[PDB]
């Protein structure tokens, strides 16, 4: 009995994050209580390190095999291995990033599809390359816009594969992806971290069009390249507790990282409205969504 | 079951609270299962409501357990039956918005009439009780005379909405 | 293409001064057109240039007396100046203006600039502010004497202001080796210059020499024969 | 404005753009020879003109920081000019002045003998009661030539006008004197000589009326 939603390697996952984050990338200022916090904070560059799950001995994980497992379902082939496999844990908002490819068919997951306030994981075919970077140094010389650059093409198709999956779980209704009704700032905006910096990006680009089916579909042709605009901040919104926290700039010149995206967090609206159509949002935050993203198909047991 | 009044442009804080005393998922929506807000993680997120641009929370609270939802300039369209999903638990409200204006000329001279109105939400069935500066009364289901206007009427009037054994009170000064 | 300016060389102290250029080869509504000066003593300055969609752009510091314009029929530019005064005194130069762009980064962003070259100039015309009486050259030949098998020939062109007065030789005929002079300025202020040519002595009485002299201030044309 | 450089003929000139640059530049050189039109000789940063040598050459804008400049390998004699570095980078705004400009002058040429030319009071001149005479100075370096007149083994005491010499398309300096006198004054001798000197070496000559 599996049970993505509700497992506990997913906390302690989050846990290890949480505590890599210190020592890694130290806040000058957490602000609480208000407890005010302080602490020095030496300009790093940071690049997360793959982390292992491990079962203590006397206890197990078992490794569903299923290659298009739900996560919450019995599971009929199943395996027993020490430790997960190494799971690079980026902490990001609104795409999923270098996370392992889903074998075969594109997966969709919710803890409850009918619920709208439940997130619904996307799990991915192949992956889709965007490339991020913050140009001028910082303003000396040039003043340049720091930026993230997908495929318009490969976007598409990738649109057209989460197309095919969610029609099947919403009866056929046209779906409609649209931004992020309201919220805080790094979850309006795909917000993630390249060599230390914390980029904002505008994903609204990503999520403009209409489909009836997975072809005829509106508002999905344009240029060949997707530029995404991003602003950069320092002082930000905390994900691993509530309060703002001041962050160090990194050592300087051009911040250049290229992500897989190997995932979406969605969110539909629903409620009683109908028209027959289903709206889609990304969200994220919750970063446990991110690690049950990699962590569906392993569960500890007693032995 | 809570019944919640409100004025027009008022602020309501509908209270919400966990069995933890710490901070996890909770979303806020309306009648209609639209999303009205909620939290992901540390973040607050708006859902695509009417209450959107007004709607908002206490997220210093979040941390025991704490998630209130707060609108501020209420309008009586966002009278309605809120709900709080936290923790498989499915706290109810309704909120009652009421509005009761003059729109007086600010010089009623004397002889003249009030003139004063009650904006209701549907499904409402409010009572209105005025009682004047020196003592007079006048009942309203809906609307509000004053059959003859004297000087002694002037002055700061004191209004009791009454709705669902609760009660809320305008105060309006007149000429 | 090829640009030829012309203007008054005089202009009078509280008037408006006026030159222009006519190009040759292409179309004058093809080009970027730009205006360009050198006052004595003074850098070159910038005027102002106007583009091929005739849209106009003046350098800030000509206060705005400045007026560039396109006539497309007689297929010439011009340019007015307001109000001049003794420091509007300089040579005008019309050249071709050509707007390049200098992509730094990502165009959507609008992370470029764009700058301006002038490959193509005019000779350039001199003009003088000035309330004096303007005046044309009278030339008088300067006969061959009679080392082998050349000698040598010219014109004297006295009294003509103002600079510059131009000479040929045969009409255009006679390119090598013709040495026109620097002129000379009088203590009556007028200049007076000379231009000679080495050719052989066995060409003397058969070959017949004429100079021309073009004097456009004034606008006096002349030719004159040099004979032993 | 006019900042001067002097370089060795055949050496190497390096003349930097009086202005830095803040930020991606098109920087544009311009040579000028007064009295003539500016040529253009460098566009984008490094690119060439047709009709303009190799020897001319700008500095590409590939890193941050490296400093604008021309540079004439092997300058020849006809190098002498103003030379003028406009400046465009993406922080400043449009560029509006060209700038200082840099006079070149070419040290030190060869030695040239001046090449001299007199000339009688023409007929048609002569007619009309004037009687100049023009002695013609040529192709010489240093432009440096004294002239006086002759008249006849006496210094003429009047009417004599030089002019300061000026270089020219051969690169090497032209003067110009012209003695002016009365017809009678010019037949009351009976020679007229003007002597050019040119670094101590003096050359003369001599017309008489006819
Ligand atoms: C996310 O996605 C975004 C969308 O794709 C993406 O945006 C891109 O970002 C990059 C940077 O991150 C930008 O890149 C730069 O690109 C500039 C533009 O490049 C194009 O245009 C130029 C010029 O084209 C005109 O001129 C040439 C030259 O004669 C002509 O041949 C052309 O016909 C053309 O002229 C016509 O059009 C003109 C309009 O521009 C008209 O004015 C004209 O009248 C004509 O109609 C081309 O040269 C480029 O092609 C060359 O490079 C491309 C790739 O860029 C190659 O594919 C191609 O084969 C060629 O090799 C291209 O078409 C560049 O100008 C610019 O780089 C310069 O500046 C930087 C810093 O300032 C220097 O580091 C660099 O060295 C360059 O400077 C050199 O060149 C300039 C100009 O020549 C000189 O002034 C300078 O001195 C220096 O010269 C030296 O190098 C030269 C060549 O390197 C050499 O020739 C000289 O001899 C000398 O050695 C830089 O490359 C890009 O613009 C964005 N693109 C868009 C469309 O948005 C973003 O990057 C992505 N980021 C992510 C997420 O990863
Ligand atoms: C990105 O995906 C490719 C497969 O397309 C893989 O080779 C590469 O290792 C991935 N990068 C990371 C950082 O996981
Ligand atoms: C899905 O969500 C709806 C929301 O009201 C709920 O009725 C239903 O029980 C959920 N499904 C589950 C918990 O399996
Ligand atoms: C992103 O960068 C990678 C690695 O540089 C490259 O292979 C890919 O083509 C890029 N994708 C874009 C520019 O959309
Ligand atoms: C996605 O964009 C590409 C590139 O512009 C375009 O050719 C294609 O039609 C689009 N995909 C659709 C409409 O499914
Ligand atoms: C970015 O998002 C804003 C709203 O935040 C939207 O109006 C705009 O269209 C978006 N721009 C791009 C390039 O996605
Ligand atoms: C979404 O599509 C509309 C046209 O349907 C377009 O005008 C708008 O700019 C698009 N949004 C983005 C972010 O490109
Ligand atoms: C994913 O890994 C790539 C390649 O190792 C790296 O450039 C990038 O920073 C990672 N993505 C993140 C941290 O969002
Ligand atoms: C689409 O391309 C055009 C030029 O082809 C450009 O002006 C525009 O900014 C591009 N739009 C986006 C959203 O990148
Ligand atoms: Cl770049």
């Known amino acids: 009995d599996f049970n993505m939603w509700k497992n506990n390697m997913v906390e302690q996952m989050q846990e290890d994050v949480i505590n890599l984050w210190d020592q890694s990338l130290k806040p000058c200022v957490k602000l609480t209580g208000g407890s005010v916090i302080t602490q020095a904070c030496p300009k790093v560059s940071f690049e997360p390190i793959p982390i292992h799950y491990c079962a203590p001995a006397g206890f197990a994980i078992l490794k569903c095999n299923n290659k298009t497992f739900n996560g919450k379902g019995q599971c009929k082939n199943v395996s027993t291995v020490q430790c997960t496999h190494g799971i690079r844990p980026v902490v990001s908002t609104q795409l999923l990033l270098n996370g392992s490819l889903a074998e075969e068919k594109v997966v969709i997951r919710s803890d409850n599809f009918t619920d709208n306030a439940k997130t619904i994981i996307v799990q991915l075919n192949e992956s889709v390359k965007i490339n991020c970077t913050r140009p001028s140094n910082n303003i000396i010389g040039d003043i340049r816009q720091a930026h993230c650059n997908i495929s318009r093409a490969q976007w598409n198709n990738t649109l057209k594969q989460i197309v095919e999956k969610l029609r099947e779980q919403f009866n056929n209704k046209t779906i409609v992806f649209t931004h992020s009704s309201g919220g805080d700032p790094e979850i309006v905006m795909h917000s993630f971290n390249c060599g230390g910096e914390f980029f904002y990006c505008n994903s609204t680009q990503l999520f403009n069009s209409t489909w009836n089916d997975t072809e005829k579909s509106s508002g999905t042709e344009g240029n060949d390249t997707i530029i995404l605009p991003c602003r950069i901040k320092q002082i930000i919104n905390m994900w691993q507790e509530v309060g703002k926290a001041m962050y160090a700039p990194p050592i300087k010149g051009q911040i250049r990282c290229s992500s897989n995206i190997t995932g979406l967090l969605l969110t539909r609206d629903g409620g009683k409205n109908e028209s027959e159509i289903e709206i889609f949002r990304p969200g994220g935050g919750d970063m446990r969504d991110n690690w049950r993203s990699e962590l569906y198909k392993y569960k500890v047991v007693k032995i | 079951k809570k019944v919640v009044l409100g004025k027009k442009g008022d602020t309501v804080e509908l209270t919400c609270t966990a069995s933890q005393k710490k901070s996890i998922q909770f979303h806020w929506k309306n009648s209609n299962q639209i999303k009205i807000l909620g939290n992901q993680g540390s973040f607050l997120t708006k859902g695509p409501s009417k209450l959107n641009d007004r709607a908002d929370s206490r997220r210093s609270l979040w941390d025991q357990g704490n998630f209130p939802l707060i609108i501020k300039n209420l309008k009586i369209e966002d009278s309605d039956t809120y709900i709080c999903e936290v923790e498989d638990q499915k706290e109810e409200v309704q909120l009652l918005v009421f509005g009761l204006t003059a729109n007086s000329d600010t010089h009623l001279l004397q002889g003249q009439s009030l003139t004063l109105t009650l904006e209701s939400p549907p499904g409402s069935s409010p009572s209105v009780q005025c009682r004047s500066p020196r003592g007079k009364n006048i009942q309203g289901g809906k609307t509000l005379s004053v059959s003859q206007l004297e000087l002694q009427d002037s002055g700061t009037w004191t209004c009791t909405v009454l709705q669902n054994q609760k009660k809320v009170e305008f105060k309006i000064d007149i000429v | 293409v090829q640009l030829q300016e012309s203007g008054p060389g005089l202009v009078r102290p509280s008037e408006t001064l006026s030159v222009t250029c006519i190009v040759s080869?292409?179309?004058?509504?093809?080009?970027?057109w730009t205006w360009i000066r050198q006052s004595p003593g003074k850098g070159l300055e910038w005027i102002g240039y106007?583009?091929?969609?005739?849209?106009?752009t003046y350098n800030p510091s000509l206060n705005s007396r400045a007026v560039i314009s396109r006539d497309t029929s007689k297929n010439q530019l011009s340019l007015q100046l307001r109000s001049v005064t003794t420091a509007d005194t300089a040579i005008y130069f019309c050249?071709?203006?050509?707007?390049?762009?200098?992509?730094?980064?990502?165009?959507?962003?609008?992370?470029?600039?764009?700058?301006?070259?002038?490959?193509?100039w005019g000779k350039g015309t001199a003009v003088t502010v000035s309330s004096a009486s303007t005046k044309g050259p009278s030339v008088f030949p300067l006969a061959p004497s009679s080392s082998g098998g050349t000698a040598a020939l010219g014109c004297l062109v006295k009294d003509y202001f103002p600079e510059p007065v131009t000479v040929s030789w045969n009409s255009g005929a006679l390119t090598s080796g013709v040495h026109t002079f620097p002129a000379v300025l009088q203590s009556s202020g007028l200049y007076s210059l000379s231009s000679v040519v080495t050719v052989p002595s066995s060409s003397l009485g058969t070959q017949t020499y004429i100079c021309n002299v073009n004097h456009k201030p004034s606008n006096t044309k002349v030719d004159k024969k040099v004979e032993p | 404005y006019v900042s001067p450089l002097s370089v060795a003929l055949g050496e190497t000139a390096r003349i930097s753009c009086g202005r830095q640059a803040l930020g991606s530049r098109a920087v544009q050189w311009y040579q000028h020879k007064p009295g003539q039109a500016p040529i253009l000789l460098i566009y984008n940063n490094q690119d060439r003109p047709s009709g303009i040598p190799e020897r001319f050459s700008g500095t590409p804008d590939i890193n941050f920081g490296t400093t604008a400049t021309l540079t004439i390998s092997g300058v020849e004699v006809g190098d002498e000019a103003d030379y003028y570095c406009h400046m465009w980078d993406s922080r400043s705004g449009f560029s509006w002045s060209f700038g200082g400009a840099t006079r070149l002058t070419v040290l030190s040429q060869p030695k040239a003998a001046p090449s001299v030319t007199l000339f009688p009071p023409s007929s048609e001149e002569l007619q009309a009661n004037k009687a100049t005479l023009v002695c013609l100075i040529s192709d010489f370096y240093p432009g440096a030539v004294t002239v006086a007149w002759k008249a006849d083994s006496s210094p003429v005491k009047a009417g004599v006008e030089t002019t300061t010499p000026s270089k020219q398309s051969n690169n090497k300096y032209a003067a110009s004197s012209y003695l002016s006198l009365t017809p009678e004054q010019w037949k009351s001798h009976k020679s007229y000589s003007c002597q050019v000197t040119h670094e101590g070496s003096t050359v003369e000559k001599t017309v008489a009326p006819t």
């Open positions: 106007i583009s091929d969609r005739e849209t106009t």
């Open positions: 050249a071709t203006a050509r707007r390049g762009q200098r992509i730094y980064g990502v165009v959507s962003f609008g992370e470029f600039f764009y700058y301006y070259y002038m490959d193509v």
């Open positions: 080869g292409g179309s004058i509504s093809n080009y970027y």
